[PDB]
């Protein structure tokens, strides 16, 4: 017997309660960060290693460029929820 | 051993829901940038080995039904399952064209007791959506 | 600038909405599993590797023994929330 | 370039909050077994290198003050911070002896803008507590 909720992983683009930023011409930050990392390392890194680097890239490479100063120079951190029971490699 | 068994015929299905346009009643704006995200996601997840499927401008009922049917397919020869949601969101909740639906109810379809052919196999959900309205002002 | 919510990790004993089980004479399931893995692997494995093996041991090794069939033969999966931006080793 | 810098004088503080006995007003029972947990946690986290301190049967105000103060100490020579909570719980929320306090309010004291000496350093929270009343019936 095993738990019905086991072996899920949720990679949210942002932490509970917060905004998620989307560039109209370049795409949402989380996705473009995610695709970059997967292109370079999807076949050689473990899923948490992948998403941790994604966390880093969204946290460091991105800051909202906006005119309304209510939204000027804001930041974003994604949020990984893992119920996985093993390491996961795509190979 | 400590890794998920990857010796299957297929890596698995990758369902992408690319919600760009919303009914005016929801007050939700057009999500510019999203097709670009969907195109990049599709190429990445194809390259990894997933059978990628892209759905566009889905209603709440469509999101539940296509997720419920995917749960009912036979995944015996698949190593894992992946779903990617691109839409408007608020906490615990993702937007369809129609309005709002809880994320837990979309993912519940794949619980061990409700999707036996994915038992002991990873079920991945990537979610690009707001989870509220707070802002992260940063620090140097 | 970096996000104010970055670099947190929450190792919850259970998933949102669910019970968390405690044996009155042997300790809570999550803790004994966590201490087991830390005793053997705390200094050689990355934090996500550690908590993933903990997730596995709680899912497989534990099943509630109670007479009231409302609580008979129930299961548990813990839940890791990572806003980490780097790999973490305790060495 | 992909791991947290660990070359500091201390691994860091590890606050363990071990709530066993509760006020009659809360109606919650004695958490038997919780002192076996804390002592095992104490040895494990000490063996890793943490400066561990175990506080017992804490009120909500003490838990907020404990964590607020730890947040205000000087962590320049610390690699990280760890806090462990053993108590009764319901979702988003942890029990003191007197009642309940939101888990978010315990952790917020360590946000980057509120604790500069732990900036860019891991902040770990281990939480043994119920998060609701759904039950996981399993599957063979």
Curated annotation (Swiss-Prot), chains B, D:
Superkingdom of origin: Eukaryota
Active site: 88, 130
Swiss-Prot/TrEMBL site (Involved in allosteric regulation) positions: 131
Effect seen on changing residue 136 to A: Strongly reduced thiol protease activity
Outcome (variant: residue 131 to W/N): Strongly reduced thiol protease catalytic efficiency
Modification Phosphothreonine occurs at: 117
Renumbered residue ranges of the record's region Loop L1: 20-31
Region (Loop L2): 131-140
Protein name, as recorded: Caspase-7 subunit p20
The organism of origin for this protein: Homo sapiens (Human)
Residues of the full protein shown: 57 to 196 of 303
């Amino acid at each position: 017997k095993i738990p019905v909720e086991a072996d899920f992983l949720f990679a949210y683009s942002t932490v509970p309660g917060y905004y998620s930023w989307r560039s109209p011409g370049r795409g949402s930050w989380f996705v473009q960060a995610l695709c970059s990392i997967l292109e370079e390392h999807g076949k050689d890194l473990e899923i948490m290693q992948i998403l941790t680097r994604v966390n880093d890239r969204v946290a460091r490479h991105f800051e909202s460029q906006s005119d309304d100063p209510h939204f000027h120079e804001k930041k974003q951190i994604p949020c990984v929820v893992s119920m996985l029971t093993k390491e996961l490699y795509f190979s | 051993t400590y890794q998920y068994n990857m010796n299957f015929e297929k890596l698995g299905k990758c369902i992408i829901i690319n919600n760009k346009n919303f009914d005016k009643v929801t007050g939700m704006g057009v999500r510019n940038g999203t097709d670009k995200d969907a195109e990049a996601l599709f190429k990445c997840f194809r390259s990894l080995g997933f059978d990628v499927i892209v759905y566009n401008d889905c209603s709440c009922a469509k999101m539940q039904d296509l997720l419920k049917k995917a749960s009912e397919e036979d995944h015996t020869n698949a190593a894992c399952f992946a779903c990617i949601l691109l839409s408007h969101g608020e906490e615990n909740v993702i937007y369809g064209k129609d309005g709002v639906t809880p994320i837990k109810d979309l993912t519940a379809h794949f619980r061990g007791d409700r999707c036996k052919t994915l038992l002991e196999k990873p079920k991945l959900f990537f979610i690009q959506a707001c989870r509220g309205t707070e802002l992260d002002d940063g620090i140097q």
